[PDB]
Ligand binder design. Structure first.
Ligand SMILES: CC(C)=CCC/C(C)=C/CC/C(C)=C/CC/C(C)=C/CC/C(C)=C/CC/C(C)=C/CC/C(C)=C/CC/C(C)=C/COP(=O)(O)OP(=O)(O)O
Ligand SMILES: CC(C)=CCC/C(C)=C/CC/C(C)=C/CC/C(C)=C/CC/C(C)=C/CC/C(C)=C/CC/C(C)=C/CC/C(C)=C/COP(=O)(O)OP(=O)(O)O
Lengths: 169, 168
């Protein structure tokens, strides 16, 4: 069993969201995350606790970024952070998913992240073990009270593409 | 027909390796512009697009600035990347763009696969808008961008392209 702290400079949730009913895909990410992983490879368990600052969104449009902070969408004044906690599941000898709960826009809903890749190595600078993952999830944003655009043909399905690296304490 | 890219819905996003599979860097370039031609009867069309290197966003300001330097893109020398290509149709629908990318002053062949294509009247502008999601992949060392190669970094770089163009 081991405890690791996410390296913010290599931990980001990226997303994909719909524009105009399939016209194109909005892609972007949140720049500021932090948290902790625990992993016990021999017991085939582990956990994640991660927090993302909503104000750190980047869409490519500074105007959209600022607009999404308002009460029409994230209401970042009331809910500055999103938080995910979950239990790591293994399939064979490697982690394969995290089953847990996301709190976004003040609302808590189930969310499972599938782990597409997992690697551990000695960190080229800090020396201690660093574990890294690529993971994916999807949710319907209206389940978190985020239904803007629904009345105009926008699809609520939101994809998450997660980069994370965590360094053993 | 001729269409101008709407910069606010046109972005090349990317995926790149970190430490030989440790994780995936994701980001995008925020500023692009250009033009599409489409003759859907004749089943042909073209793309001409330019992206500003200084518009890169990776989530890490330190990395964004390091990428500008002569160690990587050398934006003082080469501020823009430019892609031109010919649209191919798989019948009625565009399916790919076959062309050339100029990146870091080097021109190489690059094919973009079109995963989705839709045209519709634009809500606000009241002219036709066409939109695509497209993908491509290249090896960055083919453009002289080999940083990290000595240290196990993979050179395969994926492009995930969002584009919307409004009919003139
Ligand atoms: C071993 C190890 C490393 C283990 C770890 C394992 C692991 C999997 C760890 C998890 C790590 C991490 C980082 C997890 C992240 C978890 C978190 C907190 C996730 C939540 C992320 C989050 C905040 C998601 C929100 C996503 C959303 C809803 C984004 C916004 C999408 C968006 C752009 C919607 C469109 C809105 C609008 C208004 C569009 C219209 O455009 P507009 O320009 O106005 O004009 P037009 O009129 O043309 O439409
Ligand atoms: C009808 C219609 C709409 C038709 C249109 C069809 C169509 C397909 C149109 C195309 C539209 C568009 C927008 C096309 C775009 C084409 C263009 C010009 C594409 C080029 C984009 C471009 C500039 C690509 C470059 C991508 C690259 C190489 C990005 C950087 C990758 C990167 C971050 C690599 C990592 C490098 C390093 C050094 C990482 C290590 O640093 P770090 O992790 O901080 O370090 P350490 O751990 O030590 O701290």
């Amino acid at each position: 069993s081991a405890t690791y702290q996410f390296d913010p400079s290599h931990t980001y949730p990226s997303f994909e969201a719909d524009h105009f009913g399939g016209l194109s895909v909005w892609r972007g990410k949140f720049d500021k995350s932090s948290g902790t992983v625990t992993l016990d490879r021999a017991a085939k368990t582990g956990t994640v606790d991660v927090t993302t600052d909503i104000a750190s969104i980047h869409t490519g449009s500074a105007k959209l970024d600022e607009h999404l902070q308002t009460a029409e969408f994230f209401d970042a004044a009331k809910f500055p952070q999103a938080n995910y906690k979950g239990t790591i599941k293994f399939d064979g000898d490697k982690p394969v998913s995290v089953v847990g709960n996301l709190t976004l826009h003040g609302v808590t809903k189930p969310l499972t992240l599938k782990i597409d890749s997992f690697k551990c190595m000695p960190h080229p600078m800090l020396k201690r073990e660093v574990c890294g993952v690529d993971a994916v999830g999807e949710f319907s944003r209206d389940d978190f009270g985020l239904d803007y655009g629904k009345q105009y043909g926008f699809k609520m399905k939101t994809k998450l593409l997660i980069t994370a690296e965590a360094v053993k304490q």
